[PDB]
Design a protein around this ligand. Sequence first.
Ligand SMILES: Nc1ncnc2c1ncn2[C@H]1C[C@H](O)[C@@H](COP(=O)(O)OP(=O)(O)OP(=O)(O)O)O1
Ligand SMILES: [Mg+2]
Ligand SMILES: [Mg+2]
Lengths: 414, 555
Amino acid sequence: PIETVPVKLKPGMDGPKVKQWPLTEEKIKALVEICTEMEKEGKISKIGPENPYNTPVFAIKKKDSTKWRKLVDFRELNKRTQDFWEVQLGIPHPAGLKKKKSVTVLDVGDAYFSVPLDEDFRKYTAFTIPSINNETPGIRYQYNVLPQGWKGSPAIFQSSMTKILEPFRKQNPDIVIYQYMDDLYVGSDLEIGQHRTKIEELRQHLLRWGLTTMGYELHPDKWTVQPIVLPEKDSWTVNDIQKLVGKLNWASQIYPGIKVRQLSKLLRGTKALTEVIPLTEEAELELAENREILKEPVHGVYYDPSKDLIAEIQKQGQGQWTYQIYQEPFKNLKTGKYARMRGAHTNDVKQLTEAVQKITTESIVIWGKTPKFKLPIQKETWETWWTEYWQATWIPEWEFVNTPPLVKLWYQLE
Amino acid sequence: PISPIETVPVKLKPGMDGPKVKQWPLTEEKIKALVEICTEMEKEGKISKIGPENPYNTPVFAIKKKDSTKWRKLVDFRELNKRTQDFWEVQLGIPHPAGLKKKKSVTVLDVGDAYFSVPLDEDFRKYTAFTIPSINNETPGIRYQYNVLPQGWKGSPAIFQSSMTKILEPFRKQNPDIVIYQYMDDLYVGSDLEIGQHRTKIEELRQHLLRWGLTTPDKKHQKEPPFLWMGYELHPDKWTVQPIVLPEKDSWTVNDICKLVGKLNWASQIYPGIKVRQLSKLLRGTKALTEVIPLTEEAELELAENREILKEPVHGVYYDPSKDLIAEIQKQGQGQWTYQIYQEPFKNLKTGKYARMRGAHTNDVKQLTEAVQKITTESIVIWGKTPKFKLPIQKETWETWWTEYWQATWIPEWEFVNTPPLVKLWYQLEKEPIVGAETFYVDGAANRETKLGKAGYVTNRGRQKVVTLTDTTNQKTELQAIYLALQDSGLEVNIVTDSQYALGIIQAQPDQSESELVNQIIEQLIKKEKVYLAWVPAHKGIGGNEQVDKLVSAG
DNA sequence: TGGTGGGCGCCCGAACAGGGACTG
DNA sequence: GTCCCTGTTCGGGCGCCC
Ligand SMILES: Nc1ncnc2c1ncn2[C@H]1C[C@H](O)[C@@H](COP(=O)(O)OP(=O)(O)OP(=O)(O)O)O1
Ligand SMILES: [Mg+2]
Ligand SMILES: [Mg+2]
């Protein structure tokens, strides 16, 4: 047998105890079918109620597939797992990945079931399948092999992935292949079609080792940043200048170069909001400086791996969303937009989660690390629906915030 | 018999030892029931006498069962439970009659002495030491321990539940198309087989059960709608709840109340339009279960209203997978809501009430969205899918809201329903400043030390007022100023405030508040024809923020 | 007459958890 | 830091079932 590898939790920390949330008939049917099969192949085993631990599960319907994918929300366990992340992984992040014409995401999660999982850790990977209308109690399982979605899994399997891939990388040194959790990211500057042929070629290797081997066609170089922007106007009203001065006072925490004084001078007195104020040539020029100070990129922002990325998102309306990624406040690393169908049936929640899968996907590609999201939505709404729209094998930490109606007005686009 | 199933290995919590607790005095009646129970159990090897090897002891008692004839032997293992390892519980929730679909034949079975037919971990047996006192002249008396699950132990229910699922597993595999709703030891069994073939199958089940040590006495519902199950009576085409009897005290008390609400909430699953807001309110500051409380005129009324609605004959129906789930929601008062779920129009599957208040400030459209939310998760439990809705809210009101709201929000597929009271937005903030409307620059300040404040405004037309406030806070003074400008302006007005706090509340378009102050504001906002609220950074000399800030700073 | 256990539900009140605004 | 205000969680009582 392939030798088992000793795996600990972080000191002082106890395994996950998160209650399973309700699933749809559709989903349970799948989970049950998938699970009895994993059990038949010895990958997971029934367990009882004296195992104290638990971690929710569900399923996704990848692409237009007839195939369901089990997804075990493991981010609790992962949080609490000893750092192989740091203590048992030596991975530099492929900076060249962020710059490839095309990048395809393959799900190599399956190759994990080949390695057995440390006997003593197993009880921590426990999960429970629900039944419709509670016709039965929950049916509990735990892993024997390496679970997909457990951060331990890529670390443990690292060695063998390097063996398996080594030949393919050797011949395609211009192809960069990066692993993250269940995911293999593969980038080429090939023209699509030959790239795609390279991806089916890589899948032919990942089959000669088994067993066996969605989210297709990223382009890290078609991405771009969204600046803060100032309106252009022929006549300005008190209200215009009041909104202008408010936007900048804040923008100045990001770009300390921004100046407001002269524009404020126009807002002397106590004027009616709709009164038109002529822009004294200096303030007319101060709006020229700032307008440029906003162009020179934010200074002095260095990525620290030992801190989480934070992601703030704002609903901009009419299908529009804005995000910023930072680690310290006002020190953005990237800041972007995300537009969508302004149709009649726009589903705010579905977009929110398509927004967080894109923003995550970028973060992984750029830093190899998941961002923590500050979501502009109610906890319950979000939890009622988000998995109906998930397509990723990973799940980012998040927290819900009621964003100040102000912060949106700053990043808003013209 | 005792189930031949293997035991579930349990531990005490690390460093902890099993209980040493004196038996408290038992009734005579109860002691006779106990030795009667204990000697028969002991004969069957479910308990066995221990000696001075066992240092432990935990108190034991009995109560009558539902049939009131038989006695239940309990054990107060509060001490031991406290020291027992944790379990992941596996009863995820409670099966509902509205989740049953029609079956051609139906049986309900209950198991004999269920817990006592399931073995307990050998190594743990010692901690379950108890002692049945006898007549003080005839016996010490006898000291036993459990070789099976005790009724009172923290680990029993989960282990029984697991073991039953284990035990039934094989039968279910052989019989994937016979449905067994398994609640602890209470089995609902349904099929699409003719009576006599079903009945055969029932006999296979009892024998399978019996082969695993589980006896099924009668106690067995048969050719016998109505079936008594899980608190209901199941008839072939309809189900109802076993009659609910609300108390009739004339000096209700916290406990009388907490149990009045209890029953009504239970009731609301099938009785439409039950409300418990005014009643629940009474429950507020009171510090003791016993604390007797006088009814408010409206709780008084509310209760009367519920009383009359229970007087009515209501049933539910069984679920038809080949048909939509429909949920219709009515608005009640006071952030209270009723829904009814059905597939055919006047044949309810079940009903319900959402009344919870989230948030200091909110409006009807947010609540309605929360009612929808909750009803969705519930449907997904009970039927494992989502219902189509019937909401008392115009498509327009929603579209407006969803555009105006800076948060993501969404309601699944729905349709409008002319059933008042309709849900509306009770007023609209302008997006652009209003031409020809007096502009108010408002502000507040409060002395943190003395709690003394001023709130006021300067307007562009030359007027300016300051109100002194006492015992206030910064935020309150700023809400106060916004309130003053509304009071002293026409149907159309522009207000400039330097206060994110206050700007964030009013922008969210509340129609309800815990705050008496924010209420008074809401009233004014409804009276007005056009309001526009813009923000500006404070202490930045942006007059006339400059100016009104100067007026309200005598603190 | 009390005195036990687990599940789910509902309410309510405590402990926190943040943000925002203050002081000189 | 300090006050506020607001949100979350948890636990307690009651209901119902076994
Ligand atoms: N008040 C209670 N305290 C602790 N456990 C209980 C209580 N009520 C029920 N249970 C658990 C223990 C039982 O073994 C199981 C089955 O309930 P029930 O069928 O009504 O009694 P029973 O199965 O033990 O004997 P029987 O039903 O033949 O009279 O439910
Ligand atoms: Mg029984
Ligand atoms: Mg102010």
